[PDB]
């Protein structure tokens, strides 16, 4: 407890930076994926209302990319670290396996309920590899859990509702086998809009074979391969906050930084999950403005396309990611950078690759001149109509400057207070 408090007080803002960094030493890169996994481990806040309506507090993340980008490795690591983690492959378990069923007991003649895969994993993690190979119908079955975290069962003589408040990791391959750079993400993913919208985060991983990236990946893989556990004879067949430095696992260059131990990380994650943050008013307006900007970005998308549609659930995802990031560091309130981190994550995940004076003046002049239907217009009506339909009565000096510029353009002539085209 004392060590946790000391680490929280000393490392104030670095916690969320360090835990994502020290999440998986055996996996190189994918900082955003590590941050998302950390947010999943921290989790959101479930809110129950006076009316009894339930609002989901879980996050769903889908990873799509080329083969051999260490996605199954991340899934296995999450399975090992998470307390209640259940792996369910695509065709390994059907809807009957995932959803609790009803069996008629022959001994007594009554009907009993047998829990499914997701029912047992309450407040846990469910990992689904090869999510593309899963049929659409199991997707519809999982939709209810992903929406409200509950399963309703009704077979003649019995009816019940079971809690399924859980988080889901999903790993899927593109329809063509390898992601197409030229084709749009919609064709490559090949999934319905509802399923993508129900997912909170979408990550696209590309096996970019850059010279330095290939060299670094090869060096990391070779260093991990050549590593051998201490205390063991060579050739044999077969708690401090910061991990002890190793020449092979870390390297000479990485001597300036240290990684957090697994046990201390688990204890800190549990303590953080215990913590219940409270949202602040200052961040609410900023989040709302950024959400409005995101929704209006359709006219500012440039050549970039969107991986997932933006709906009302994106605001919920932003709030939940902010809550998780506030849970990352032991605190009580939500700050600006707390929302900024979630906004940056959404920007990264969602998108993949005076003069107004003159225009208003010209529009007003058009309206004035063909509301008169004549080539001469009185000055009083001119000024009244120009400054009436416009929210701003424009400055006289700048109006005269524009008039002089247009006179140099031989478009408008003003004589004795009367304007002629």
């Amino acid at each position: 407890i004392a060590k946790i408090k000391k680490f929280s007080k000393t490392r104030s803002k670095d916690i969320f930076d360090q835990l994502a960094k020290s999440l998986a030493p055996s996996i190189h890169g994918h900082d955003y994926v590590k941050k998302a996994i950390l947010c999943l481990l921290l989790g959101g806040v479930e809110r129950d209302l006076e009316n009894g309506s339930h609002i989901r507090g879980d996050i769903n993340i889908l990873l799509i990319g080329d083969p051999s980008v260490a996605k199954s490795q991340l899934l296995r690591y999450v399975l090992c670290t998470a307390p209640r983690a259940i792996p369910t492959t695509g065709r390994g378990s059907s809807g009957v396996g995932l959803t609790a069923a009803v069996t008629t007991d022959q001994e007594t003649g009554e009907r009993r309920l047998e829990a499914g895969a997701m029912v047992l994993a309450d407040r846990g993690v469910v990992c689904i590899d090869e999510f593309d190979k899963m049929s659409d119908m199991d997707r519809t079955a999982i939709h209810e859990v992903m929406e409200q975290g509950r399963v309703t069962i009704a077979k003649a003589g019995i009816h019940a509702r079971l809690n399924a408040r859980c988080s889901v990791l999903a790993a899927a391959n593109p329809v063509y086998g390898r992601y197409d750079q030229y084709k749009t993400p919609m064709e490559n993913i090949g999934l319905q809009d509802s399923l993508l919208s129900r997912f909170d985060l979408l990550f696209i991983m590309l096996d970019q074979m850059d010279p330095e990236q290939d060299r670094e990946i090869s060096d990391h893989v070779l260093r991990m391969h050549r590593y051998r556990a201490p205390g063991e004879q060579d050739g044999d067949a077969m708690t401090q906050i910061y991990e002890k430095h190793d020449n092979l696992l870390h390297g000479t260059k990485k001597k300036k930084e240290k990684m957090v131990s697994a046990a201390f990380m688990k204890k800190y994650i549990h303590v953080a999950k215990i913590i219940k943050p409270v949202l602040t008013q200052e961040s609410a307006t900023y989040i709302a403005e950024e959400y409005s900007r995101l929704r209006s970005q359709d006219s500012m998308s440039s050549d970039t396309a969107r991986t997932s549609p933006v709906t009302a659930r994106t605001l919920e995802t932003l709030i939940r990611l902010a809550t998780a990031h506030a849970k990352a560091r032991m605190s009580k309130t939500v700050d600006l950078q707390d929302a900024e981190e979630a906004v940056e994550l959404v920007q990264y995940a969602y998108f993949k690759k005076s003069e107004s004076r003159l225009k208003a003046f010209k529009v007003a002049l058009l309206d004035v001149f063909r509301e008169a239907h004549a080539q001469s217009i009185g000055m009083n009506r001119l000024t009244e109509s120009i400054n009436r339909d416009s929210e701003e009565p424009f400055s006289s000096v700048e109006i005269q400057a524009a008039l002089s510029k247009m006179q140099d353009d031989n478009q408008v002539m003003v004589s004795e207070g009367i304007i002629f085209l």
Binding site: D193, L279, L315
Partner: protein, 134 residues
């Protein structure tokens, strides 16, 4: 399901995502409220075939349902997600207030309780007005 909701309301969604074989049996229930008796009020939900309603295409093509089936529905209501900036901002702020305050935004009058509305509907169903000839 239709029999279970006798003298009640059968709310069915994803109507456009069902085979025509069941649709054929739905016509008799709509026309005569019988199957056994099926005296129920049908409330159906539907989505466009392509995921977005296209005003260029005809209504039947956008609904991929027969004209007779739509005619047997006494009321048809289309809702389109038309993008309006002010309306979008108002919807967003209302959603924020519902999320944060656990409650609806404060309207002019507080809505009645569910039990009170149920009793009021039960009492109003008891009366059988007679149509005047005027």
């Amino acid at each position: 399901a239709l029999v279970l909701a006798d003298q009640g309301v059968c709310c069915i969604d994803e109507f456009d995502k069902m085979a025509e074989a069941d649709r054929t049996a739905i016509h008799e229930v709509m026309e005569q409220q019988t199957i056994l008796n099926a005296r129920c009020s049908i409330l159906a939900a539907a989505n466009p075939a392509y995921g977005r309603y296209n005003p260029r295409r005809s209504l039947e093509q956008n609904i991929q349902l027969p004209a007779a089936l739509l005619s047997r529905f006494d009321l048809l209501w289309l809702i389109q997600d038309r993008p309006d900036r002010d309306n979008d901002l108002r919807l967003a702020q209302h959603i924020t207030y519902v999320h944060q305050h656990s409650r609806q935004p404060p309207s002019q009058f507080e809505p009645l309780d569910m039990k009170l509305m149920r009793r009021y509907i039960a009492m109003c169903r008891e009366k059988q007005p007679m149509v005047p000839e005027s």
